[PDB]
Amino acid sequence: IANQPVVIDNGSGVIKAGFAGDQIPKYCFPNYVGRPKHVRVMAGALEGDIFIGPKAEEHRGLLSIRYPMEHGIVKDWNDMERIWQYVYSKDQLQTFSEEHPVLLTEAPLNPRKNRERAAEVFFETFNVPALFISMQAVLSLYATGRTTGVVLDSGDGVTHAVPIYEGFAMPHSIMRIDIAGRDVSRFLRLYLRKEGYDFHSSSEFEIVKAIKERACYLSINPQKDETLETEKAQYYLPDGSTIEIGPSRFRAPELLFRPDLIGEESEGIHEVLVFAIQKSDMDLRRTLFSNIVLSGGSTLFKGFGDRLLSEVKKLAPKDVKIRISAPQERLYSTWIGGSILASLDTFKKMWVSKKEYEEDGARSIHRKTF
């Protein structure tokens, strides 16, 4: 028994933290640790060798950025645990981890060892009352308010499409690809270096990421815009210098639709959506084409809807009606879902208690999850 459960969306790009019932996540910060590279010589300097969130955003130049989790897989647990320690700090939430239950939102088709280690931290380090792991796709629909529908969630770490019927995810029709937002930022960097703009440093790559998010358009006809001479729109850098992006603006984000550009022998994002529906039974295909939901950060590109709809038509069967629904709050659809689920009385039965974890161990979270 507790006051109010805390929802924590373990996003690859940014961590979204808030209480169940809250309309928006109150505390959103980037999911990386910044350590100072330069030597401290003078007294009354910035104290601490660890900077997370707005403290790392303000003094970014001083710090070396290292992301603990890549493609939704935690490589460094020491850094990931310290970030969850920061979630309960005086900056974000400012509450006792033993007092409030936690709801975590993990990517689909993750290893079981991740959930087992994740559970150990919150029951051993943080002595949480109860922990409930939830899928990203199911929560996105709960937010939108549809029980049946295909969730095309193109995140910072991974892109995946989950066909869900009456709140149940079809484990055999799930399609996930490693290519995500981080690959577009690195792929754009390759074009900027060829144009003659170098961003070698990890601190400089965050500016390329800001440039990528600011200036990238998804062309309706690729070859037409390649052949036409661009205006070479200038972008103002932090120092004051101006860069001419030119054709690299729309040529970088094409990777999502053509993985052949980076050299990875995978299907395009438009093929993932159609292929995932075609795998499902004949009776649902028509409903799944009728109920398509867009999610993830990489869907925010201008003209994504018009380009995707055109690509789906080519791959989709003839005489099929295609209705693609994109909520205005795409980024916060997973969290808002967690807030609704946590608010439901059934949630009291759904989560795993600290006592149940101590008795059965790793089995406890596997039994009351699966």
Partner: protein
């Protein structure tokens, strides 16, 4: 400041400006994407 303390010293600059500075000068897309059979 401590002017009467530094005043004893020979090499203290006075009648100069302290600071030399330049003149101060001066929607996400929605959904509902559909197409019929």
């Amino acid at each position: 400041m401590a002017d009467p303390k530094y005043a004893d010293l020979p090499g203290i600059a006075r009648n100069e400006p302290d600071v030399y500075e330049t003149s101060d000068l001066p929607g996400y897309e929605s959904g509902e994407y559909e197409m019929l059979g």
